């Protein structure tokens, strides 16, 4: 039923600078993979920390009971989008235990060992 | 002997191309493992039974899982490993070599 | 007032040799309300540990530290396997990418 | 003045046709004993080795030979024990 905990911290965080186009496959698709094996919906709140400015408010998001959910940091926008080419860190909190795992590059980038 | 590890483990990442779970049972009692696969859009897929004998290790390829059903490829999943006795569970996602020598193969 | 993390961390691995490439970095987070006075110690396989590398991580702030940028007491010999111990007066969260995984990712990334 | 613990386990192990990085930030030498586990046969005796006080030490599994060398192209696992706390990391 309830595996994991309600508070996770990720000291690393970085979205490489790109142009005004769609982020490239050769870039840090830094994602936060979350699992909620529980029977109650997980109301996740993410806080981003920086090296020079104050923390950016609660980024709400939900992870349905008995479900997983990958969250690209780049896709975060409310309250605000994360400044690219900036070192950040994050804290993930939930009402129910969840399992969190940071990935610097998602699954389908590794799917390129094909040559 | 040793009863290292725990009876419950969770792996948030899981993805098969068109990953292995390494388990160690340093204990004296056989480990009756039950694996549950979670998805992002559908309900969990039933208990995948398996056994890890006492004082033995065992590498389980997720692709080799088939009963209740095979794991859909090109699909992001997650898993929960449970045992009656403490076991040590580990997962490696990015093969250092196969990645380091794929670059060479430009 | 997130008093998350602990006052002591250790990294068994350590090794110094575009933009999308990462390297020997120690990312630290201090979600607390008190400034973090971090002290890093570097260990080697053949010589004694190199003194306290002081550094500060302000309350409610993060901070990435390149091992290469460490210089006082002294710079870390490149092409040398080392390890480190990070201590603080207040709880901090410390994260480092396992050398192998790092090199590997950069390999896949490089690959056009 | 010690970090880490006296026991570590590694579920993965494989030498194709892997290094254990240890750190001993303590003031007492660490007498490490490694046990290799397999999927079909019993565990292979104590592989002794020492990690000097305030020192690190990388140990290639391939370099292990006493009691015996580790069969290549074979999936194995290991348990690392010490008389004093050490920090271990598989690579």
mmCIF file of C-alpha atoms in Angstrom:
data_model
loop_
_atom_site.group_PDB
_atom_site.id
_atom_site.type_symbol
_atom_site.label_atom_id
_atom_site.label_comp_id
_atom_site.label_asym_id
_atom_site.label_seq_id
_atom_site.Cartn_x
_atom_site.Cartn_y
_atom_site.Cartn_z
ATOM 1 C CA UNK A 1 0.000 0.000 0.000
ATOM 2 C CA UNK A 2 1.974 2.992 1.272
ATOM 3 C CA UNK A 3 5.626 2.963 0.205
ATOM 4 C CA UNK A 4 7.901 6.000 0.175
ATOM 5 C CA UNK A 5 7.622 9.263 2.043
ATOM 6 C CA UNK A 6 5.889 12.662 1.884
ATOM 7 C CA UNK A 7 9.022 14.785 1.482
ATOM 8 C CA UNK A 8 11.855 14.512 -1.058
ATOM 9 C CA UNK A 9 14.730 16.833 -1.913
ATOM 10 C CA UNK A 10 16.770 17.147 -5.117
ATOM 11 C CA UNK A 11 19.947 19.220 -4.754
ATOM 12 C CA UNK A 12 20.669 19.208 -8.484
ATOM 13 C CA UNK A 13 18.635 21.007 -11.119
ATOM 14 C CA UNK A 14 19.522 22.367 -14.552
ATOM 15 C CA UNK A 15 17.832 23.005 -17.896
ATOM 16 C CA UNK A 16 20.566 23.745 -20.511
ATOM 17 C CA UNK A 17 20.169 26.921 -22.591
ATOM 18 C CA UNK A 18 18.770 26.357 -26.036
ATOM 19 C CA UNK A 19 17.309 28.725 -28.600
ATOM 20 C CA UNK A 20 13.750 29.849 -29.065
ATOM 21 C CA UNK A 21 12.898 26.478 -30.528
ATOM 22 C CA UNK A 22 11.813 23.109 -29.071
ATOM 23 C CA UNK A 23 14.337 21.764 -26.559
ATOM 24 C CA UNK A 24 16.709 19.324 -28.417
ATOM 25 C CA UNK A 25 17.111 15.595 -27.824
ATOM 26 C CA UNK A 26 20.758 16.204 -26.887
ATOM 27 C CA UNK A 27 19.684 18.092 -23.790
ATOM 28 C CA UNK A 28 19.027 17.461 -20.097
ATOM 29 C CA UNK A 29 15.396 16.315 -20.107
ATOM 30 C CA UNK A 30 15.734 16.533 -16.314
ATOM 31 C CA UNK A 31 12.646 14.805 -15.073
ATOM 32 C CA UNK A 32 11.125 13.927 -11.701
ATOM 33 C CA UNK A 33 9.615 10.438 -11.884
ATOM 34 C CA UNK A 34 6.951 9.928 -9.238
ATOM 35 C CA UNK A 35 5.072 6.834 -8.167
ATOM 36 C CA UNK A 36 2.012 6.665 -5.955
ATOM 37 C CA UNK A 37 1.329 3.023 -5.198
ATOM 38 C CA UNK A 38 -1.240 4.161 -2.660
ATOM 39 C CA UNK A 39 -5.041 4.151 -2.813
ATOM 40 C CA UNK A 40 -5.329 7.898 -2.252
ATOM 41 C CA UNK A 41 -4.619 10.609 -4.803
ATOM 42 C CA UNK A 42 -1.327 12.378 -4.231
ATOM 43 C CA UNK A 43 -1.433 16.162 -4.110
ATOM 44 C CA UNK A 44 2.180 17.059 -4.806
ATOM 45 C CA UNK A 45 3.714 20.486 -4.168
ATOM 46 C CA UNK A 46 7.086 21.349 -5.641
ATOM 47 C CA UNK A 47 9.307 24.197 -4.509
ATOM 48 C CA UNK A 48 12.266 25.379 -6.573
ATOM 49 C CA UNK A 49 15.298 26.850 -4.842
ATOM 50 C CA UNK A 50 18.000 29.016 -6.411
ATOM 51 C CA UNK A 51 21.518 30.100 -5.532
ATOM 52 C CA UNK A 52 20.841 33.856 -5.448
ATOM 53 C CA UNK A 53 17.114 34.465 -5.154
ATOM 54 C CA UNK A 54 14.292 33.275 -2.882
ATOM 55 C CA UNK A 55 12.308 30.012 -3.456
ATOM 56 C CA UNK A 56 9.606 30.088 -6.115
ATOM 57 C CA UNK A 57 6.174 29.281 -4.657
ATOM 58 C CA UNK A 58 4.192 25.985 -4.658
ATOM 59 C CA UNK A 59 3.970 24.224 -8.042
ATOM 60 C CA UNK A 60 0.835 22.153 -7.551
ATOM 61 C CA UNK A 61 0.338 18.862 -9.367
ATOM 62 C CA UNK A 62 -1.519 15.613 -8.739
ATOM 63 C CA UNK A 63 -0.536 11.954 -8.966
ATOM 64 C CA UNK A 64 -3.616 9.680 -9.016
ATOM 65 C CA UNK A 65 -3.800 6.691 -6.715
ATOM 66 C CA UNK A 66 -1.944 3.606 -7.989
ATOM 67 C CA UNK A 67 -0.318 5.616 -10.786
ATOM 68 C CA UNK A 68 3.047 6.969 -11.885
ATOM 69 C CA UNK A 69 3.882 10.330 -13.405
ATOM 70 C CA UNK A 70 6.979 11.799 -14.994
ATOM 71 C CA UNK A 71 7.348 15.531 -14.525
ATOM 72 C CA UNK A 72 9.706 17.491 -16.741
ATOM 73 C CA UNK A 73 10.992 20.492 -14.820
ATOM 74 C CA UNK A 74 10.918 22.450 -18.077
ATOM 75 C CA UNK A 75 7.168 21.837 -18.321
ATOM 76 C CA UNK A 76 6.693 23.637 -15.008
ATOM 77 C CA UNK A 77 5.187 27.115 -15.502
ATOM 78 C CA UNK A 78 2.761 27.994 -12.706
ATOM 79 C CA UNK A 79 3.599 30.039 -10.600
ATOM 80 C CA UNK A 80 6.427 30.609 -13.069
ATOM 81 C CA UNK A 81 8.697 28.893 -15.638
ATOM 82 C CA UNK A 82 12.140 27.790 -14.460
ATOM 83 C CA UNK A 83 14.911 30.061 -15.854
ATOM 84 C CA UNK A 84 16.990 28.015 -18.295
ATOM 85 C CA UNK A 85 20.781 27.732 -17.901
ATOM 86 C CA UNK A 86 20.328 28.212 -14.152
ATOM 87 C CA UNK A 87 21.394 25.876 -11.360
ATOM 88 C CA UNK A 88 18.420 25.092 -9.128
ATOM 89 C CA UNK A 89 17.271 22.555 -6.545
ATOM 90 C CA UNK A 90 13.835 21.296 -5.543
ATOM 91 C CA UNK A 91 11.708 19.917 -2.719
ATOM 92 C CA UNK A 92 8.784 17.597 -3.408
ATOM 93 C CA UNK A 93 6.047 17.286 -0.816
ATOM 94 C CA UNK A 94 2.870 15.243 -0.747
ATOM 95 C CA UNK A 95 -0.084 14.507 1.495
ATOM 96 C CA UNK A 96 0.527 10.784 1.063
ATOM 97 C CA UNK A 97 3.724 8.777 0.744
ATOM 98 C CA UNK A 98 5.166 8.765 -2.778
ATOM 99 C CA UNK A 99 8.375 7.477 -4.322
ATOM 100 C CA UNK A 100 10.470 10.048 -6.180
ATOM 101 C CA UNK A 101 13.398 9.513 -8.543
ATOM 102 C CA UNK A 102 15.393 12.173 -10.401
ATOM 103 C CA UNK A 103 16.516 11.477 -13.970
ATOM 104 C CA UNK A 104 18.969 13.742 -15.801
ATOM 105 C CA UNK A 105 17.858 12.355 -19.154
ATOM 106 C CA UNK A 106 14.601 10.530 -19.857
ATOM 107 C CA UNK A 107 14.128 7.029 -21.259
ATOM 108 C CA UNK A 108 13.668 7.911 -24.932
ATOM 109 C CA UNK A 109 16.991 9.765 -25.139
ATOM 110 C CA UNK A 110 18.815 6.615 -24.077
ATOM 111 C CA UNK A 111 16.793 4.873 -26.798
ATOM 112 C CA UNK A 112 19.498 6.311 -29.063
ATOM 113 C CA UNK A 113 22.171 3.718 -28.384
ATOM 114 C CA UNK A 114 20.813 2.566 -31.744
ATOM 115 C CA UNK A 115 23.590 2.816 -34.321
ATOM 116 C CA UNK B 1 22.874 -15.767 8.970
ATOM 117 C CA UNK B 2 22.358 -12.343 7.398
ATOM 118 C CA UNK B 3 18.911 -10.793 7.053
ATOM 119 C CA UNK B 4 20.109 -7.730 5.161
ATOM 120 C CA UNK B 5 17.762 -5.596 3.120
ATOM 121 C CA UNK B 6 14.027 -5.186 3.534
ATOM 122 C CA UNK B 7 10.737 -6.731 2.473
ATOM 123 C CA UNK B 8 9.609 -3.876 0.244
ATOM 124 C CA UNK B 9 11.242 -1.883 -2.544
ATOM 125 C CA UNK B 10 9.986 0.583 -5.154
ATOM 126 C CA UNK B 11 11.471 1.685 -8.473
ATOM 127 C CA UNK B 12 9.934 4.815 -9.983
ATOM 128 C CA UNK B 13 11.622 4.339 -13.383
ATOM 129 C CA UNK B 14 10.968 1.539 -15.869
ATOM 130 C CA UNK B 15 11.252 1.416 -19.648
ATOM 131 C CA UNK B 16 11.811 -1.296 -22.242
ATOM 132 C CA UNK B 17 13.102 -0.720 -25.812
ATOM 133 C CA UNK B 18 11.629 -2.644 -28.778
ATOM 134 C CA UNK B 19 16.117 -2.828 -17.563
ATOM 135 C CA UNK B 20 17.049 -5.437 -14.964
ATOM 136 C CA UNK B 21 16.188 -5.789 -11.300
ATOM 137 C CA UNK B 22 19.050 -7.376 -9.399
ATOM 138 C CA UNK B 23 18.019 -9.164 -6.235
ATOM 139 C CA UNK B 24 20.117 -10.612 -3.467
ATOM 140 C CA UNK B 25 18.884 -12.945 -0.749
ATOM 141 C CA UNK B 26 21.702 -13.344 1.724
ATOM 142 C CA UNK B 27 19.240 -15.016 4.094
ATOM 143 C CA UNK B 28 18.687 -18.677 4.938
ATOM 144 C CA UNK B 29 15.081 -18.749 3.813
ATOM 145 C CA UNK B 30 13.961 -18.711 0.205
ATOM 146 C CA UNK B 31 12.462 -15.413 -0.875
ATOM 147 C CA UNK B 32 9.000 -15.520 -2.456
ATOM 148 C CA UNK B 33 9.060 -12.254 -4.397
ATOM 149 C CA UNK B 34 5.969 -10.522 -5.809
ATOM 150 C CA UNK B 35 6.392 -7.744 -8.356
ATOM 151 C CA UNK B 36 3.752 -5.156 -9.215
ATOM 152 C CA UNK B 37 4.018 -2.958 -12.311
ATOM 153 C CA UNK B 38 2.456 0.483 -12.252
ATOM 154 C CA UNK B 39 1.540 2.623 -15.243
ATOM 155 C CA UNK B 40 0.747 6.264 -15.870
ATOM 156 C CA UNK B 41 -2.719 5.673 -17.377
ATOM 157 C CA UNK B 42 -4.034 2.202 -16.494
ATOM 158 C CA UNK B 43 -4.369 0.162 -13.293
ATOM 159 C CA UNK B 44 -1.451 -1.901 -11.868
ATOM 160 C CA UNK B 45 -0.839 -5.298 -13.407
ATOM 161 C CA UNK B 46 -1.237 -8.200 -10.958
ATOM 162 C CA UNK B 47 1.406 -10.028 -8.852
ATOM 163 C CA UNK B 48 4.347 -11.354 -10.899
ATOM 164 C CA UNK B 49 5.526 -14.254 -8.718
ATOM 165 C CA UNK B 50 9.146 -15.350 -8.601
ATOM 166 C CA UNK B 51 11.537 -16.989 -6.154
ATOM 167 C CA UNK B 52 15.020 -16.084 -4.985
ATOM 168 C CA UNK B 53 16.551 -19.045 -3.083
ATOM 169 C CA UNK B 54 18.338 -18.652 0.224
ATOM 170 C CA UNK B 55 21.906 -17.330 0.019
ATOM 171 C CA UNK B 56 21.541 -16.605 -3.698
ATOM 172 C CA UNK B 57 21.268 -13.710 -6.106
ATOM 173 C CA UNK B 58 19.114 -13.304 -9.177
ATOM 174 C CA UNK B 59 18.920 -10.847 -12.040
ATOM 175 C CA UNK B 60 15.438 -10.336 -13.399
ATOM 176 C CA UNK B 61 14.977 -8.765 -16.812
ATOM 177 C CA UNK B 62 11.712 -6.853 -16.867
ATOM 178 C CA UNK B 63 11.316 -7.927 -20.489
ATOM 179 C CA UNK B 64 11.325 -11.556 -19.327
ATOM 180 C CA UNK B 65 8.236 -10.923 -17.183
ATOM 181 C CA UNK B 66 5.166 -12.408 -18.852
ATOM 182 C CA UNK B 67 2.764 -13.823 -16.274
ATOM 183 C CA UNK B 68 0.156 -12.370 -15.585
ATOM 184 C CA UNK B 69 1.141 -10.509 -18.764
ATOM 185 C CA UNK B 70 4.153 -9.087 -20.642
ATOM 186 C CA UNK B 71 5.167 -5.489 -20.040
ATOM 187 C CA UNK B 72 4.233 -3.207 -22.950
ATOM 188 C CA UNK B 73 7.422 -1.970 -24.622
ATOM 189 C CA UNK B 74 8.102 1.722 -25.268
ATOM 190 C CA UNK B 75 6.053 2.414 -22.163
ATOM 191 C CA UNK B 76 7.143 4.195 -18.999
ATOM 192 C CA UNK B 77 6.306 2.097 -15.953
ATOM 193 C CA UNK B 78 7.323 1.723 -12.299
ATOM 194 C CA UNK B 79 7.422 -1.242 -9.950
ATOM 195 C CA UNK B 80 7.021 -2.472 -6.419
ATOM 196 C CA UNK B 81 9.008 -5.491 -5.239
ATOM 197 C CA UNK B 82 7.864 -7.360 -2.170
ATOM 198 C CA UNK B 83 9.160 -10.404 -0.314
ATOM 199 C CA UNK B 84 8.315 -12.476 2.748
ATOM 200 C CA UNK B 85 11.940 -12.139 3.846
ATOM 201 C CA UNK B 86 14.397 -9.233 3.611
ATOM 202 C CA UNK B 87 16.155 -8.936 0.272
ATOM 203 C CA UNK B 88 18.440 -6.326 -1.306
ATOM 204 C CA UNK B 89 17.156 -4.816 -4.556
ATOM 205 C CA UNK B 90 19.130 -2.749 -7.054
ATOM 206 C CA UNK B 91 18.527 -1.249 -10.475
ATOM 207 C CA UNK B 92 20.966 0.272 -12.958
ATOM 208 C CA UNK B 93 19.519 2.468 -15.706
ATOM 209 C CA UNK B 94 22.453 3.730 -17.819
ATOM 210 C CA UNK B 95 25.056 1.183 -18.907
ATOM 211 C CA UNK B 96 28.396 3.015 -18.737
ATOM 212 C CA UNK B 97 30.082 0.888 -21.415
ATOM 213 C CA UNK B 98 27.314 0.201 -23.974
ATOM 214 C CA UNK B 99 26.912 3.986 -23.937
ATOM 215 C CA UNK B 100 30.608 4.779 -23.921
ATOM 216 C CA UNK B 101 31.302 2.443 -26.879
ATOM 217 C CA UNK B 102 28.251 3.469 -28.911
ATOM 218 C CA UNK B 103 29.751 6.952 -29.145
ATOM 219 C CA UNK B 104 32.932 5.413 -30.520
ATOM 220 C CA UNK B 105 30.797 3.612 -33.079
ATOM 221 C CA UNK B 106 29.799 7.209 -33.915
ATOM 222 C CA UNK C 1 11.143 25.916 7.873
ATOM 223 C CA UNK C 2 12.356 22.786 6.117
ATOM 224 C CA UNK C 3 15.076 21.393 8.378
ATOM 225 C CA UNK C 4 15.569 18.654 5.771
ATOM 226 C CA UNK C 5 18.708 16.602 5.258
ATOM 227 C CA UNK C 6 21.570 15.978 7.649
ATOM 228 C CA UNK C 7 24.803 17.527 8.881
ATOM 229 C CA UNK C 8 27.166 14.997 7.350
ATOM 230 C CA UNK C 9 27.517 13.446 3.906
ATOM 231 C CA UNK C 10 30.138 11.396 2.149
ATOM 232 C CA UNK C 11 30.971 10.702 -1.477
ATOM 233 C CA UNK C 12 33.118 7.631 -2.169
ATOM 234 C CA UNK C 13 33.724 8.625 -5.778
ATOM 235 C CA UNK C 14 35.567 11.636 -7.122
ATOM 236 C CA UNK C 15 37.499 12.264 -10.323
ATOM 237 C CA UNK C 16 38.489 15.322 -12.354
ATOM 238 C CA UNK C 17 39.445 15.071 -16.076
ATOM 239 C CA UNK C 18 29.959 22.548 -24.835
ATOM 240 C CA UNK C 19 27.167 23.396 -22.407
ATOM 241 C CA UNK C 20 25.030 20.246 -22.097
ATOM 242 C CA UNK C 21 27.871 18.403 -20.405
ATOM 243 C CA UNK C 22 28.012 17.936 -16.652
ATOM 244 C CA UNK C 23 31.005 17.252 -14.430
ATOM 245 C CA UNK C 24 32.376 16.791 -10.920
ATOM 246 C CA UNK C 25 29.841 18.795 -8.966
ATOM 247 C CA UNK C 26 28.403 18.686 -5.474
ATOM 248 C CA UNK C 27 24.942 20.162 -5.423
ATOM 249 C CA UNK C 28 23.843 21.365 -2.020
ATOM 250 C CA UNK C 29 20.505 22.577 -0.773
ATOM 251 C CA UNK C 30 19.794 24.473 2.421
ATOM 252 C CA UNK C 31 16.074 24.773 2.791
ATOM 253 C CA UNK C 32 16.648 25.986 6.341
ATOM 254 C CA UNK C 33 16.448 29.450 7.872
ATOM 255 C CA UNK C 34 20.067 29.493 9.031
ATOM 256 C CA UNK C 35 23.095 29.902 6.805
ATOM 257 C CA UNK C 36 25.042 26.722 6.274
ATOM 258 C CA UNK C 37 28.748 26.741 7.068
ATOM 259 C CA UNK C 38 29.904 23.763 4.999
ATOM 260 C CA UNK C 39 33.312 22.129 5.465
ATOM 261 C CA UNK C 40 34.581 19.756 2.798
ATOM 262 C CA UNK C 41 37.370 17.241 3.299
ATOM 263 C CA UNK C 42 39.013 15.438 0.411
ATOM 264 C CA UNK C 43 40.398 11.944 0.843
ATOM 265 C CA UNK C 44 42.907 10.122 -1.315
ATOM 266 C CA UNK C 45 44.099 6.557 -1.800
ATOM 267 C CA UNK C 46 47.780 7.174 -0.934
ATOM 268 C CA UNK C 47 48.138 10.437 0.986
ATOM 269 C CA UNK C 48 46.476 12.000 4.030
ATOM 270 C CA UNK C 49 43.232 14.048 3.849
ATOM 271 C CA UNK C 50 43.468 17.646 2.626
ATOM 272 C CA UNK C 51 42.273 20.158 5.245
ATOM 273 C CA UNK C 52 38.869 21.887 5.654
ATOM 274 C CA UNK C 53 37.632 23.558 2.448
ATOM 275 C CA UNK C 54 35.265 26.149 3.915
ATOM 276 C CA UNK C 55 32.251 27.467 2.042
ATOM 277 C CA UNK C 56 28.790 28.851 2.843
ATOM 278 C CA UNK C 57 25.308 28.044 1.626
ATOM 279 C CA UNK C 58 22.835 30.790 2.590
ATOM 280 C CA UNK C 59 19.531 29.945 4.237
ATOM 281 C CA UNK C 60 16.784 28.921 1.809
ATOM 282 C CA UNK C 61 19.274 28.624 -1.043
ATOM 283 C CA UNK C 62 20.982 25.993 -3.193
ATOM 284 C CA UNK C 63 24.545 25.919 -4.473
ATOM 285 C CA UNK C 64 26.419 23.795 -6.954
ATOM 286 C CA UNK C 65 30.076 23.338 -6.193
ATOM 287 C CA UNK C 66 32.522 22.168 -8.846
ATOM 288 C CA UNK C 67 35.262 20.142 -7.222
ATOM 289 C CA UNK C 68 37.615 21.651 -9.767
ATOM 290 C CA UNK C 69 36.854 25.128 -8.412
ATOM 291 C CA UNK C 70 38.087 24.115 -4.968
ATOM 292 C CA UNK C 71 41.504 25.623 -4.308
ATOM 293 C CA UNK C 72 41.899 26.593 -0.655
ATOM 294 C CA UNK C 73 43.662 24.929 1.187
ATOM 295 C CA UNK C 74 44.747 23.499 -2.155
ATOM 296 C CA UNK C 75 43.532 22.462 -5.628
ATOM 297 C CA UNK C 76 42.453 18.875 -6.198
ATOM 298 C CA UNK C 77 44.982 16.923 -8.283
ATOM 299 C CA UNK C 78 43.338 16.112 -11.607
ATOM 300 C CA UNK C 79 43.315 12.568 -13.011
ATOM 301 C CA UNK C 80 43.238 11.410 -9.385
ATOM 302 C CA UNK C 81 40.600 9.250 -7.703
ATOM 303 C CA UNK C 82 39.477 10.918 -4.483
ATOM 304 C CA UNK C 83 36.513 10.904 -2.117
ATOM 305 C CA UNK C 84 34.990 13.588 0.090
ATOM 306 C CA UNK C 85 33.145 14.328 3.286
ATOM 307 C CA UNK C 86 30.744 17.237 3.556
ATOM 308 C CA UNK C 87 29.802 18.576 6.975
ATOM 309 C CA UNK C 88 27.601 21.444 8.107
ATOM 310 C CA UNK C 89 26.452 23.175 11.265
ATOM 311 C CA UNK C 90 22.880 22.768 10.025
ATOM 312 C CA UNK C 91 21.054 20.086 8.026
ATOM 313 C CA UNK C 92 21.620 20.291 4.280
ATOM 314 C CA UNK C 93 20.803 18.000 1.389
ATOM 315 C CA UNK C 94 23.760 16.807 -0.702
ATOM 316 C CA UNK C 95 23.685 15.171 -4.157
ATOM 317 C CA UNK C 96 26.410 13.933 -6.540
ATOM 318 C CA UNK C 97 26.115 11.929 -9.750
ATOM 319 C CA UNK C 98 27.955 8.600 -9.728
ATOM 320 C CA UNK C 99 30.989 9.134 -11.947
ATOM 321 C CA UNK C 100 30.115 6.257 -14.263
ATOM 322 C CA UNK C 101 26.515 7.400 -14.819
ATOM 323 C CA UNK C 102 27.748 10.946 -15.510
ATOM 324 C CA UNK C 103 30.313 9.952 -18.151
ATOM 325 C CA UNK C 104 27.715 7.652 -19.691
ATOM 326 C CA UNK C 105 25.001 10.301 -20.008
ATOM 327 C CA UNK C 106 27.448 12.771 -21.554
ATOM 328 C CA UNK C 107 28.341 10.029 -24.023
ATOM 329 C CA UNK C 108 24.726 9.558 -25.116
ATOM 330 C CA UNK C 109 24.218 13.340 -25.193
ATOM 331 C CA UNK C 110 27.391 14.056 -27.168
ATOM 332 C CA UNK C 111 26.396 11.480 -29.792
ATOM 333 C CA UNK C 112 25.010 14.169 -32.155
ATOM 334 C CA UNK D 1 34.717 10.686 13.776
ATOM 335 C CA UNK D 2 33.326 7.870 11.590
ATOM 336 C CA UNK D 3 30.880 7.939 8.668
ATOM 337 C CA UNK D 4 29.078 5.089 6.957
ATOM 338 C CA UNK D 5 28.339 1.618 8.206
ATOM 339 C CA UNK D 6 29.923 -1.783 8.736
ATOM 340 C CA UNK D 7 27.809 -3.613 6.195
ATOM 341 C CA UNK D 8 26.911 -3.025 2.546
ATOM 342 C CA UNK D 9 25.289 -5.180 -0.072
ATOM 343 C CA UNK D 10 25.406 -4.959 -3.868
ATOM 344 C CA UNK D 11 22.740 -6.856 -5.778
ATOM 345 C CA UNK D 12 24.393 -6.315 -9.134
ATOM 346 C CA UNK D 13 27.637 -7.884 -10.296
ATOM 347 C CA UNK D 14 29.001 -8.758 -13.720
ATOM 348 C CA UNK D 15 32.367 -9.057 -15.467
ATOM 349 C CA UNK D 16 31.893 -9.329 -19.281
ATOM 350 C CA UNK D 17 34.053 -11.531 -21.613
ATOM 351 C CA UNK D 18 32.847 -3.098 -12.124
ATOM 352 C CA UNK D 19 34.656 -1.531 -9.171
ATOM 353 C CA UNK D 20 33.860 -1.187 -5.496
ATOM 354 C CA UNK D 21 34.977 2.225 -4.257
ATOM 355 C CA UNK D 22 35.547 2.268 -0.519
ATOM 356 C CA UNK D 23 36.270 5.147 1.799
ATOM 357 C CA UNK D 24 37.530 4.910 5.365
ATOM 358 C CA UNK D 25 37.387 8.377 6.861
ATOM 359 C CA UNK D 26 38.064 6.923 10.294
ATOM 360 C CA UNK D 27 41.168 6.709 12.454
ATOM 361 C CA UNK D 28 41.289 2.912 12.566
ATOM 362 C CA UNK D 29 42.270 0.673 9.682
ATOM 363 C CA UNK D 30 39.350 -1.168 8.114
ATOM 364 C CA UNK D 31 39.610 -4.920 7.739
ATOM 365 C CA UNK D 32 37.080 -5.550 4.983
ATOM 366 C CA UNK D 33 35.625 -8.975 4.149
ATOM 367 C CA UNK D 34 33.778 -9.431 0.856
ATOM 368 C CA UNK D 35 31.419 -12.300 0.088
ATOM 369 C CA UNK D 36 30.343 -13.098 -3.458
ATOM 370 C CA UNK D 37 26.930 -14.588 -4.070
ATOM 371 C CA UNK D 38 25.690 -16.417 -7.146
ATOM 372 C CA UNK D 39 22.380 -17.531 -8.639
ATOM 373 C CA UNK D 40 23.030 -21.291 -8.671
ATOM 374 C CA UNK D 41 25.916 -22.073 -6.293
ATOM 375 C CA UNK D 42 26.789 -21.256 -2.681
ATOM 376 C CA UNK D 43 28.615 -18.044 -1.618
ATOM 377 C CA UNK D 44 32.368 -17.879 -2.080
ATOM 378 C CA UNK D 45 34.317 -17.481 1.155
ATOM 379 C CA UNK D 46 35.756 -14.313 2.761
ATOM 380 C CA UNK D 47 37.858 -12.163 0.427
ATOM 381 C CA UNK D 48 40.066 -10.277 2.898
ATOM 382 C CA UNK D 49 41.490 -6.841 2.199
ATOM 383 C CA UNK D 50 42.370 -3.732 4.185
ATOM 384 C CA UNK D 51 41.525 -0.055 3.842
ATOM 385 C CA UNK D 52 43.936 2.144 5.869
ATOM 386 C CA UNK D 53 42.637 4.790 8.223
ATOM 387 C CA UNK D 54 41.759 8.079 6.495
ATOM 388 C CA UNK D 55 42.155 6.534 3.033
ATOM 389 C CA UNK D 56 40.104 5.428 0.060
ATOM 390 C CA UNK D 57 40.498 2.310 -2.065
ATOM 391 C CA UNK D 58 39.040 1.142 -5.335
ATOM 392 C CA UNK D 59 38.669 -2.635 -5.679
ATOM 393 C CA UNK D 60 38.101 -4.165 -9.102
ATOM 394 C CA UNK D 61 36.010 -7.294 -8.734
ATOM 395 C CA UNK D 62 38.117 -8.815 -11.498
ATOM 396 C CA UNK D 63 41.236 -8.421 -9.351
ATOM 397 C CA UNK D 64 39.741 -10.605 -6.613
ATOM 398 C CA UNK D 65 41.362 -14.054 -6.648
ATOM 399 C CA UNK D 66 41.654 -15.438 -3.110
ATOM 400 C CA UNK D 67 39.807 -17.656 -2.165
ATOM 401 C CA UNK D 68 39.085 -17.751 -5.882
ATOM 402 C CA UNK D 69 38.639 -15.593 -9.017
ATOM 403 C CA UNK D 70 35.111 -14.520 -9.977
ATOM 404 C CA UNK D 71 33.799 -16.435 -13.008
ATOM 405 C CA UNK D 72 33.452 -13.993 -15.889
ATOM 406 C CA UNK D 73 30.197 -13.679 -17.825
ATOM 407 C CA UNK D 74 28.367 -14.596 -14.618
ATOM 408 C CA UNK D 75 25.762 -12.577 -12.720
ATOM 409 C CA UNK D 76 26.795 -12.232 -9.087
ATOM 410 C CA UNK D 77 26.181 -10.119 -6.005
ATOM 411 C CA UNK D 78 28.257 -9.186 -2.964
ATOM 412 C CA UNK D 79 28.265 -8.211 0.683
ATOM 413 C CA UNK D 80 30.959 -5.955 2.107
ATOM 414 C CA UNK D 81 31.579 -6.043 5.858
ATOM 415 C CA UNK D 82 34.036 -4.098 7.990
ATOM 416 C CA UNK D 83 35.087 -3.918 11.633
ATOM 417 C CA UNK D 84 34.661 -0.152 11.427
ATOM 418 C CA UNK D 85 32.243 2.115 9.536
ATOM 419 C CA UNK D 86 33.164 2.663 5.886
ATOM 420 C CA UNK D 87 31.415 4.216 2.909
ATOM 421 C CA UNK D 88 30.942 2.007 -0.126
ATOM 422 C CA UNK D 89 29.844 2.844 -3.668
ATOM 423 C CA UNK D 90 29.439 0.502 -6.643
ATOM 424 C CA UNK D 91 30.753 1.743 -10.026
#
